[PDB]
Ligand binder design. Sequence first.
Ligand SMILES: *[C@@H]1O[C@H](CO)[C@@H](O[C@@H]2O[C@H](CO)[C@@H](O[C@@H]3O[C@H](CO)[C@@H](O)[C@H](O[C@@H]4O[C@H](CO)[C@@H](O)[C@H](O)[C@@H]4O)[C@@H]3O)[C@H](O)[C@H]2NC(C)=O)[C@H](O)[C@H]1NC(C)=O
Ligand SMILES: *[C@@H]1O[C@H](CO)[C@@H](O[C@@H]2O[C@H](CO)[C@@H](O[C@@H]3O[C@H](CO)[C@@H](O)[C@H](O[C@@H]4O[C@H](CO)[C@@H](O)[C@H](O)[C@@H]4O)[C@@H]3O)[C@H](O)[C@H]2NC(C)=O)[C@H](O)[C@H]1NC(C)=O
Ligand SMILES: *[C@@H]1O[C@H](CO)[C@@H](O[C@@H]2O[C@H](CO)[C@@H](O)[C@H](O)[C@H]2NC(C)=O)[C@H](O)[C@H]1NC(C)=O
Ligand SMILES: *[C@@H]1O[C@H](CO)[C@@H](O[C@@H]2O[C@H](CO)[C@@H](O)[C@H](O)[C@H]2NC(C)=O)[C@H](O)[C@H]1NC(C)=O
Ligand code: BGL
Ligand code: BGL
Ligand code: BGL
Ligand code: BGL
Ligand code: BGL
Ligand code: PLM
Ligand code: PLM
Lengths: 326, 326
Amino acid sequence: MNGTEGPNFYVPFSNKTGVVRSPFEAPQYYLAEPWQFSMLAAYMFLLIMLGFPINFLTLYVTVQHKKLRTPLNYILLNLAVADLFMVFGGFTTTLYTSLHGYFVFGPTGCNLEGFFATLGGEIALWSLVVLAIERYVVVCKPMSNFRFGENHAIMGVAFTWVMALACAAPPLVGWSRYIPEGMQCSCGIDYYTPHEETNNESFVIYMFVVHFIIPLIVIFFCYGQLVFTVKEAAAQQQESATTQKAEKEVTRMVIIMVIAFLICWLPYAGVAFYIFTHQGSDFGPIFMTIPAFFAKTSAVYNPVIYIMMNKQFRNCMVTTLCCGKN
Amino acid sequence: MNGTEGPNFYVPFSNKTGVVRSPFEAPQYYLAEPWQFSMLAAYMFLLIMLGFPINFLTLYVTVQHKKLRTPLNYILLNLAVADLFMVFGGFTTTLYTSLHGYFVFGPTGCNLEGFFATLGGEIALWSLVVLAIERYVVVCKPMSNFRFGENHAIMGVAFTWVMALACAAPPLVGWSRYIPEGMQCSCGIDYYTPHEETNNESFVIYMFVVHFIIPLIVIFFCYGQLVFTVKEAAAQQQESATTQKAEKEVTRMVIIMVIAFLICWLPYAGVAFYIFTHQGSDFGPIFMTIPAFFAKTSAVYNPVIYIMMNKQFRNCMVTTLCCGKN
Ligand SMILES: *[C@@H]1O[C@H](CO)[C@@H](O[C@@H]2O[C@H](CO)[C@@H](O[C@@H]3O[C@H](CO)[C@@H](O)[C@H](O[C@@H]4O[C@H](CO)[C@@H](O)[C@H](O)[C@@H]4O)[C@@H]3O)[C@H](O)[C@H]2NC(C)=O)[C@H](O)[C@H]1NC(C)=O
Ligand SMILES: *[C@@H]1O[C@H](CO)[C@@H](O[C@@H]2O[C@H](CO)[C@@H](O[C@@H]3O[C@H](CO)[C@@H](O)[C@H](O[C@@H]4O[C@H](CO)[C@@H](O)[C@H](O)[C@@H]4O)[C@@H]3O)[C@H](O)[C@H]2NC(C)=O)[C@H](O)[C@H]1NC(C)=O
Ligand SMILES: *[C@@H]1O[C@H](CO)[C@@H](O[C@@H]2O[C@H](CO)[C@@H](O)[C@H](O)[C@H]2NC(C)=O)[C@H](O)[C@H]1NC(C)=O
Ligand SMILES: *[C@@H]1O[C@H](CO)[C@@H](O[C@@H]2O[C@H](CO)[C@@H](O)[C@H](O)[C@H]2NC(C)=O)[C@H](O)[C@H]1NC(C)=O
Ligand SMILES: CCCCCCCCO[C@@H]1[C@@H](O)[C@H](O)[C@@H](CO)O[C@H]1O
Ligand SMILES: CCCCCCCCO[C@@H]1[C@@H](O)[C@H](O)[C@@H](CO)O[C@H]1O
Ligand SMILES: CCCCCCCCO[C@@H]1[C@@H](O)[C@H](O)[C@@H](CO)O[C@H]1O
Ligand SMILES: CCCCCCCCO[C@@H]1[C@@H](O)[C@H](O)[C@@H](CO)O[C@H]1O
Ligand SMILES: CCCCCCCCO[C@@H]1[C@@H](O)[C@H](O)[C@H](CO)O[C@H]1O
Ligand SMILES: *C(=O)CCCCCCCCCCCCCCC
Ligand SMILES: *C(=O)CCCCCCCCCCCCCCC
């Protein structure tokens, strides 16, 4: 056996040598060199120094530039908020713990951090999903006489919140659980311990099916159609140089978006399904943190992709940062 | 006394408790907590993750886009290269070094690192100076029948190399010295030890005068004139919105450039001149590390300012990064 189990945790290292300590009570320098904890920190620091300004600037610029304030932009605001939760609930906490070498805030800290950290990543996720439903809806016009507006934009955000609660909340109250992962400095869902008094199994399938497969299907279908509709319309207006250009652009973007959504969750889900099929073969603390690296670094690239890459917002950003105009 | 001397170094901590060890042989965790060392690393990691791509992209995109390859841009290429020397000669080695807690490469490692780190920052600075001489020369047209071209462009680059050798070289062979600074992880010129078998004094004056004042004076004069000339021409052509716009814009930049230049060296020279006046009053390992922060972080902002900020290169960058077109 490659792990050593505690009542609130699973350190992925073997206590045959008796050196394993609780991830809530003492440094874990036996499962990773302290220089590696330093890099854990360097990484969290990078995520903050980029993530905060990128996601903050986004809210701030909307507050200043009124054309950015469409109902169809609401969900992108939602995205930046959720990215911020990821920063202040997850990244900073981890910065602080990595530098101690273990999770210095104990079980409740574990829950708090784990909750807000997954709440964020999940709102962000379903934001990307809602965005597509919305875009599809307004472009493919799947409804007789329908005009997307504020009320819709809203329900959409609320939906984003209800999904994420249906994901982060249950561990707190009996279904699955939160525990330190990988190097034990940050806390997340436990998808690698047949912990029965909590049904970690039914939950991971639930998580897999409802919070990965579905989102992935919905996204692909919506953007799939949207690209169809657009290429179908263009083909019918080949005399319009601009339209052909808009068509090219839209496609390139959908591709970038889908590839991005994959690069961010596939890894997490690949590891999960693997483990679920490969019962508790020692998974390096380091290895456990690869599904996590990809997902977390999204809080910087999502905003770059879905916001920074829009001639409009981009224009405002300039004005704002440049003391008024330019 | 707050220091402790050694044949090749000066630890800014007092050996009254006998805990001070050489910065070439053991961690300095008595003059800074380890997490602060980690944080040093975090910062070096940020400098690299931003500094390398920004400066590399700049070379790569030139190689790809014919328009950027004009003789007035040569010096901006020089700038990127200098920046890279800073990133590899300095930043990477400090990443490695900081995670050990001391300068694990010893004396001549000290000299090597010190040399390339200095060579970098200096070539960069004089690059900035030359750029102003050049822009002033073509815009203010101070000469009878002159046309700036390749030859000149080059003179300029050669010139930045000679000025930088004239600054990084001497400390290798008698004049001043290199030694671990601040937290003892990086090596730099010794401008805070009356070390006399090396005339640390005269060299600091020579540095203050010839590698700060002069640059300062040239830059202000050159851009002063340029802004003058441009504002004079516009006043004589108020008929043309474009012109008023260019004028407004040229000025904004010149300000930004000058302010940028100050933010980068004033602190270094502010601390220098002070110590030259305030004899070995204990400057913590931290204190002395701020003149270095402002300078080092320039390897990132210089390129954003002097390169990223021109709509042209910016366009190429897009094309390049976007796999050919867009
Ligand atoms: C990884 O493996 C380690 C070795 O098995 C283990 O560490 C040991 O944990 C036990 C407690 O469960 C420690 O027991 C204490 O021993 C010291 C004396 O050396 C005392 O502080 C104390 O003695 C007392 O004994 C009394 C009568 O039995 C008892 O009533 C008192 O409450 C008190 O316990 C303990 O007996 C032992 O020292 C630890 N050894 C080492 C090497 O640290 C780790 O817990 C294990 N890691 C995990 C994650 O479980
Ligand atoms: C900060 O302050 C520390 C205390 O002053 C100082 O550390 C001492 O450094 C000296 C060497 O200059 C060490 O001397 C050795 O002592 C040990 C035994 O305790 C032996 O390794 C060795 O014994 C012998 O001594 C004889 C010389 O008279 C002779 O037989 C051999 O040469 C052999 O060395 C040394 O004497 C001393 O142990 C150190 N103690 C501590 C606390 O480290 C640091 O150098 C100082 N840092 C500075 C000033 O740079
Ligand atoms: C401890 O680690 C090893 C992996 O290195 C695990 O050993 C595996 O055992 C299963 C038997 O069910 C085999 O399928 C694998 O081939 C074994 N791996 C090796 C080394 O060949 C072991 O499972 C781990 N301990 C546990 C189960 O916690
Ligand atoms: C170590 O620190 C002390 C005090 O910090 C230094 O003495 C200072 O000397 C100045 C000017 O001579 C006095 O005005 C102050 O009383 C001292 N500093 C302060 C702020 O109180 C002393 O010189 C230091 N040791 C060394 C290496 O010189
Ligand atoms: C750690 C010993 C001091 C020298 C460090 C040189 C870099 C080592 O680099 C590797 C890491 O990349 C790898 O992640 C771990 C296994 O998790 O093993 C280390 O030796
Ligand atoms: C961004 C700022 C983060 C600050 C992190 C501080 C971590 C300090 O962590 C140390 C322990 O690792 C050390 O062993 C004990 C000494 O008993 O003291 C603590 O403060
Ligand atoms: C997967 C959900 C949306 C992804 C759909 C993208 C399909 C790309 O569609 C491709 C275009 O990318 C390509 O430019 C032309 C050229 O012949 O051929 C199309 O079929
Ligand atoms: C990525 C850059 C690699 C840096 C690796 C840092 C190696 C420092 O590793 C040191 C050892 O060299 C030292 O012997 C012990 C003291 O008990 O402490 C360790 O942390
Ligand atoms: C790069 C290393 C510096 C990191 C930021 C410093 C935070 C300041 O906070 C610490 C204090 O807690 C410590 O007691 C002393 C203060 O005198 O050193 C400072 O750096
Ligand atoms: C053209 O549109 C194709 C490229 C544009 C896609 C956006 C790529 C930028 C992503 C930045 C993510 C940085 C995160 C840090 C991890 C390396
Ligand atoms: C409009 O242009 C007014 C603002 C001027 C823009 C110049 C500021 C760019 C700063 C980038 C440097 C960031 C350094 C990061 C620290 C490591």
